[PDB]
mmCIF file of C-alpha atoms and ligand atoms in Angstrom:
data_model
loop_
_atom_site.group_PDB
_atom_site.id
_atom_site.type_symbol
_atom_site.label_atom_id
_atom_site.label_comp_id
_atom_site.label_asym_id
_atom_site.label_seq_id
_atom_site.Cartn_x
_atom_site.Cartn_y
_atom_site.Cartn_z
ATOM 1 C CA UNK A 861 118.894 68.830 72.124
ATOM 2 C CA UNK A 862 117.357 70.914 69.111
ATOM 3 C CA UNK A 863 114.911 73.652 69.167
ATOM 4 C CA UNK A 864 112.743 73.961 66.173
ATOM 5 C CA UNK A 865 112.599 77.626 64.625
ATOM 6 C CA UNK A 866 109.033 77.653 65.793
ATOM 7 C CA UNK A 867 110.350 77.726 69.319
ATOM 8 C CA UNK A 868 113.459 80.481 69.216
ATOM 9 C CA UNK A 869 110.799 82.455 67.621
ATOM 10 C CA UNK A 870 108.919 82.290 70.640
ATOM 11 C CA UNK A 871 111.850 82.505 73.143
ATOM 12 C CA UNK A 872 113.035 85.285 70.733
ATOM 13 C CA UNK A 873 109.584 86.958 70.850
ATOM 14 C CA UNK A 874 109.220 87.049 74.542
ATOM 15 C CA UNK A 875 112.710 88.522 74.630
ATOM 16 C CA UNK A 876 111.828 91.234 72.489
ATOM 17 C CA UNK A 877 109.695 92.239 75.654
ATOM 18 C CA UNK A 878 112.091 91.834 78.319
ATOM 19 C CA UNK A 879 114.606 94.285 75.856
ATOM 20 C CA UNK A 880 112.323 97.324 76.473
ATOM 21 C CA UNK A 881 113.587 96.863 80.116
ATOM 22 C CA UNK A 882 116.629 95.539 80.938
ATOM 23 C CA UNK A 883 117.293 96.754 84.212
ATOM 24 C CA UNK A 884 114.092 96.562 85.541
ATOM 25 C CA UNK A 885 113.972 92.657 84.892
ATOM 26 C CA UNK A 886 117.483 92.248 85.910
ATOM 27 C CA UNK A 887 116.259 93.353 89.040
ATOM 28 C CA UNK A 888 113.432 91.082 89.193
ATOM 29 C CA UNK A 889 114.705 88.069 88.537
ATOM 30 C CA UNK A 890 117.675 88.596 90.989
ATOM 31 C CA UNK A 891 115.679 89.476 94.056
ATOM 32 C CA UNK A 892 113.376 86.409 93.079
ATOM 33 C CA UNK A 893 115.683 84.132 92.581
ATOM 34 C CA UNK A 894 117.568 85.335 96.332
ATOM 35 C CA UNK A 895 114.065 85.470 98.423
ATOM 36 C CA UNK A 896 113.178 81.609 96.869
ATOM 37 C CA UNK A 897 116.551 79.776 97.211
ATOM 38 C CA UNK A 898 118.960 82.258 99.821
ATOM 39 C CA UNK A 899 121.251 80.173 99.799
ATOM 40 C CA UNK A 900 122.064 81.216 96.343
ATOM 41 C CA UNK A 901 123.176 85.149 98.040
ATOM 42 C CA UNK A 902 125.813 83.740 100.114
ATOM 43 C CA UNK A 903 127.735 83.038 96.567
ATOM 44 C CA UNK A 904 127.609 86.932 95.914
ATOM 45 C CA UNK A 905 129.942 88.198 98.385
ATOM 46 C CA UNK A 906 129.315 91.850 96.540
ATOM 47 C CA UNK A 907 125.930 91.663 97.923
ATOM 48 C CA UNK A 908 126.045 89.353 100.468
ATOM 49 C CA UNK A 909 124.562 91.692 103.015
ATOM 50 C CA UNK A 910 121.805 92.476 101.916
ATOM 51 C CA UNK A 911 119.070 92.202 104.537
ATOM 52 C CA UNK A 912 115.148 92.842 103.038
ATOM 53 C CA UNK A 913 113.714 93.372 99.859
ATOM 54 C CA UNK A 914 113.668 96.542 100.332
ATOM 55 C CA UNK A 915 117.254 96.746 100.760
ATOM 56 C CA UNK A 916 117.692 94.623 97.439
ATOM 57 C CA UNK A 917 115.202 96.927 95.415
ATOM 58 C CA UNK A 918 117.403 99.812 96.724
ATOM 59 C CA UNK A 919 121.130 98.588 95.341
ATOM 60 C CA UNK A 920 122.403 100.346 92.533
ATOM 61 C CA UNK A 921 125.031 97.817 91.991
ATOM 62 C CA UNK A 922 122.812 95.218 92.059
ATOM 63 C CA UNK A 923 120.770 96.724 89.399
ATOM 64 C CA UNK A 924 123.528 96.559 87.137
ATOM 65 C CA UNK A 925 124.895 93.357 87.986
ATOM 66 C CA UNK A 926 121.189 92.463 86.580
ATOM 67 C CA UNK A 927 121.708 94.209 83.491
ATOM 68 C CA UNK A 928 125.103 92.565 82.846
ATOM 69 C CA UNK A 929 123.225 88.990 83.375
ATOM 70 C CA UNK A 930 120.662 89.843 81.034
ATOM 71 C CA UNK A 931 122.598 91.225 78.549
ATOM 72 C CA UNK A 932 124.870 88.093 78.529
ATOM 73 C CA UNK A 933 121.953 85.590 78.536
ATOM 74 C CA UNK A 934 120.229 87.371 75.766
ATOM 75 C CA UNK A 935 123.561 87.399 73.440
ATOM 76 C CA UNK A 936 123.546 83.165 74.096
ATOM 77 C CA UNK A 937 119.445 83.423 73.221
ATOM 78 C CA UNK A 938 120.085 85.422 70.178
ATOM 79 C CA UNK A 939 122.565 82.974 68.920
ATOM 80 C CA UNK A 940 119.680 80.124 68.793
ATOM 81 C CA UNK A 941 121.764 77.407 69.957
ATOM 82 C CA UNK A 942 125.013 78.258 68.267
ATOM 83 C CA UNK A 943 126.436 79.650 71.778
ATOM 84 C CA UNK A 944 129.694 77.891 72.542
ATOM 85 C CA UNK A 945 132.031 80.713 72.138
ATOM 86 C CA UNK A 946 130.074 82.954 74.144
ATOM 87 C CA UNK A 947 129.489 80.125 76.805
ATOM 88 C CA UNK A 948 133.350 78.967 77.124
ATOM 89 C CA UNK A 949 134.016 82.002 79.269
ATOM 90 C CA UNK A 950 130.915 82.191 81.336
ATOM 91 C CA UNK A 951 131.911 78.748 81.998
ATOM 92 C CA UNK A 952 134.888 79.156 83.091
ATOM 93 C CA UNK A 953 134.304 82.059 85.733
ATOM 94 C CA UNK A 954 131.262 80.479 87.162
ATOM 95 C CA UNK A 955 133.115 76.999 87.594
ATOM 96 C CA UNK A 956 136.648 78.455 88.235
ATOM 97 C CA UNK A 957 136.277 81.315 89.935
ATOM 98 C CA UNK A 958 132.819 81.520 91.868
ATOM 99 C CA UNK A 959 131.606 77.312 92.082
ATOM 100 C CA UNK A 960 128.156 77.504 91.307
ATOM 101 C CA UNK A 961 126.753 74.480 91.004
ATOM 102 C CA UNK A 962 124.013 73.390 88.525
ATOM 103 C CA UNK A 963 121.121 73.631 90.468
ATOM 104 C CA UNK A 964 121.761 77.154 91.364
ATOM 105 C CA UNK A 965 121.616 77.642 87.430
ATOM 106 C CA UNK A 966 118.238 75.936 87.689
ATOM 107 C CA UNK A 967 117.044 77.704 90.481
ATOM 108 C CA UNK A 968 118.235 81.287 88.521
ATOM 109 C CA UNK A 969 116.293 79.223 85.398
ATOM 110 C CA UNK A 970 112.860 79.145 87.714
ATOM 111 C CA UNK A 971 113.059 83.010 88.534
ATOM 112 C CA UNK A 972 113.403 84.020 85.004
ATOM 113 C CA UNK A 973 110.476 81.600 83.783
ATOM 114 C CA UNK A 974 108.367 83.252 87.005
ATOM 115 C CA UNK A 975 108.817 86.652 86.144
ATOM 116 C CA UNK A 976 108.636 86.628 82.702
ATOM 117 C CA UNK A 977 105.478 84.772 83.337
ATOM 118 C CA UNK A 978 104.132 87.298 85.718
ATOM 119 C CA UNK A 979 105.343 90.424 83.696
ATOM 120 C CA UNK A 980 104.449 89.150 80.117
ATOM 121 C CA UNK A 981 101.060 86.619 80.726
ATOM 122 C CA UNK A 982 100.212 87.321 76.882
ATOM 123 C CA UNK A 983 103.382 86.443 75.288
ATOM 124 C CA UNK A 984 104.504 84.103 77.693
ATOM 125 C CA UNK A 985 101.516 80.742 77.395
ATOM 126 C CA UNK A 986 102.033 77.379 77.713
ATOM 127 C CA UNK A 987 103.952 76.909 74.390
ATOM 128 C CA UNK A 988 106.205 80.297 74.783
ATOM 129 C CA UNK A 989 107.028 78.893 78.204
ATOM 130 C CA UNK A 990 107.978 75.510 77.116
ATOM 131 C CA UNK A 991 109.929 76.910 73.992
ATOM 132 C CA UNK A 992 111.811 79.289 76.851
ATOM 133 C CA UNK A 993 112.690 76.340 79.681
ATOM 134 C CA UNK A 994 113.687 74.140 76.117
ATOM 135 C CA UNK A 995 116.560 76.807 75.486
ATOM 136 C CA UNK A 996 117.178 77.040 78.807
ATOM 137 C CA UNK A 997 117.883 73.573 79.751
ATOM 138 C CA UNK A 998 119.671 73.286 76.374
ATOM 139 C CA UNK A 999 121.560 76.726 78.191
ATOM 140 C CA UNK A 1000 122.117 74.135 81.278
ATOM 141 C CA UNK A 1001 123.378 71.180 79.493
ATOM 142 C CA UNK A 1002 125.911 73.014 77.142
ATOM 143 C CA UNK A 1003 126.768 74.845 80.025
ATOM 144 C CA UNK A 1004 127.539 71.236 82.388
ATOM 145 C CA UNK A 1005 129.267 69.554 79.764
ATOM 146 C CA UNK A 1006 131.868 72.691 79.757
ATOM 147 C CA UNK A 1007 132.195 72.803 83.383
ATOM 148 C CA UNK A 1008 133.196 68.847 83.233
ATOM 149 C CA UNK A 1009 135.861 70.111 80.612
ATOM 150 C CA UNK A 1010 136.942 72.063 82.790
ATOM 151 C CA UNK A 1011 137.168 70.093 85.943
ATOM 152 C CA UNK A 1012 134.509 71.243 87.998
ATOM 153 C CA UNK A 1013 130.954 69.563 86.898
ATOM 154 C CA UNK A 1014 129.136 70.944 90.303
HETATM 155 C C1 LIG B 1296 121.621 82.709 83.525
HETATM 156 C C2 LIG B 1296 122.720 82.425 84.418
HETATM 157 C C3 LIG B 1296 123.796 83.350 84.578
HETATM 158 C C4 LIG B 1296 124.401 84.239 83.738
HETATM 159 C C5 LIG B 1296 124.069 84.510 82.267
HETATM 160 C C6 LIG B 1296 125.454 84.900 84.479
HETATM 161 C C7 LIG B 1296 126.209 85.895 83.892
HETATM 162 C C8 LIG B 1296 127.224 86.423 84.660
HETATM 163 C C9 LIG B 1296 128.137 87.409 84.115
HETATM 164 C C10 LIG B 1296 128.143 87.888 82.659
HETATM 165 C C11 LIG B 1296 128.965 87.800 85.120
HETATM 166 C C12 LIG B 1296 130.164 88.751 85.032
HETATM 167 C C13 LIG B 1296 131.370 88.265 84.202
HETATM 168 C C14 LIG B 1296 131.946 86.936 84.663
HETATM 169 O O1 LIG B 1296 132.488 86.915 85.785
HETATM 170 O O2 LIG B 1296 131.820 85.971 83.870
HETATM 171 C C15 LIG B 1296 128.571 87.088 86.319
HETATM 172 C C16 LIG B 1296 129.200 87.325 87.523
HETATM 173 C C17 LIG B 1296 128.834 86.512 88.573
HETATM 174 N N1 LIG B 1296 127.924 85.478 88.646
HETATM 175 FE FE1 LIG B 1296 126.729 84.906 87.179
HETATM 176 N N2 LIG B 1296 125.484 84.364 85.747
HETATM 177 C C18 LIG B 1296 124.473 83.434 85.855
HETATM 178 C C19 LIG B 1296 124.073 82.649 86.921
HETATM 179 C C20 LIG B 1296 124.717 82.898 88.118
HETATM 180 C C21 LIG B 1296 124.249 82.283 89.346
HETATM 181 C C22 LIG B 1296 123.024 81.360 89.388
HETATM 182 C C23 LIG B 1296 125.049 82.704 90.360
HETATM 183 C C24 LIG B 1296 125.091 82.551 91.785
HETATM 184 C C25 LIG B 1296 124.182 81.689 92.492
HETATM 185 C C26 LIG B 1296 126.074 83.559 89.767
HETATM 186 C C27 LIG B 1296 127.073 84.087 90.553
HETATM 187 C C28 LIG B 1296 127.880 85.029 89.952
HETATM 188 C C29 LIG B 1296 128.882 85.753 90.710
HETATM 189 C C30 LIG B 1296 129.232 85.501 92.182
HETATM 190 C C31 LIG B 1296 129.400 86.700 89.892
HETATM 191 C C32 LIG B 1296 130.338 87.856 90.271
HETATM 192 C C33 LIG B 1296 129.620 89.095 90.854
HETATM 193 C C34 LIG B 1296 130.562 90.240 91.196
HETATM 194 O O3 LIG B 1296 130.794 91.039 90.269
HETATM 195 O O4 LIG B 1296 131.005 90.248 92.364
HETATM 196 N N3 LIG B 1296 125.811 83.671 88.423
HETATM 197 N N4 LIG B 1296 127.586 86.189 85.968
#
């Protein structure tokens, strides 16, 4: 796939947003994405423990494990679809060295689509959000074909 200019402009846009709070949405999208699919925890053995919410909202470390994501999805964003240097090893540490599968990257996909949705309504309509699950599926794809590469495809 191809996204226009029109839509990284959008996706880039929306980002813009989510930069004047890194952490915060880090947070967000990590405790979404463990209350709506918890099986997806149990791959974090770093925060595996984790109980409630509450006890989520609370973690330090888990705070900046959210920055860390961000930060790394945002340098792939920025590069508007010219990614596959910083992908190779992302790729290789999620296939290699922690197994997640695919639809885990979907289900992390979801929770970032949700929140931004919920957190940024005016810069985040129909068009922005189709323009933002366009470079993330594009994220997904790039993302499969390496893991099959490397021997793993889950
Ligand atoms: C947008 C998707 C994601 C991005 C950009 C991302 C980014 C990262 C980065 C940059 C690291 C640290 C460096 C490394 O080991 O490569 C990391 C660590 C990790 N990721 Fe992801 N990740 C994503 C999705 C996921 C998902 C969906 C899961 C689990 C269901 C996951 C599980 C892990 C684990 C287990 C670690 C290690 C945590 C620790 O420090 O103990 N990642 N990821």
């Amino acid at each position: 796939m191809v996204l226009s200019e029109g839509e990284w402009q959008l996706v880039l846009h929306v980002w813009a947003k989510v930069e004047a709070d890194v952490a915060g949405h880090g947070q967000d999208i990590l405790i979404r994405l463990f209350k709506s699919h918890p099986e997806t925890l149990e791959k974090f053995d770093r925060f595996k423990h984790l109980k409630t919410e509450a006890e989520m909202k609370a973690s330090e470390d888990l705070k900046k494990h959210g920055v860390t994501v961000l930060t790394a999805l945002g340098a792939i964003l920025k590069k508007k679809g010219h990614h596959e240097a910083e992908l190779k090893p992302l790729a290789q540490s999620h296939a290699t060295k922690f197994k997640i599968p695919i639809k885990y990257l979907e289900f992390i996909s979801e929770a970032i689509i949700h929140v931004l949705h919920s957190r940024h309504p005016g810069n985040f309509g129909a068009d922005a959000q189709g323009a933002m699950n366009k470079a993330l599926e594009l994220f997904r794809k790039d993302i499969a074909a390496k893991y099959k590469e490397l021997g793993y495809q889950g």
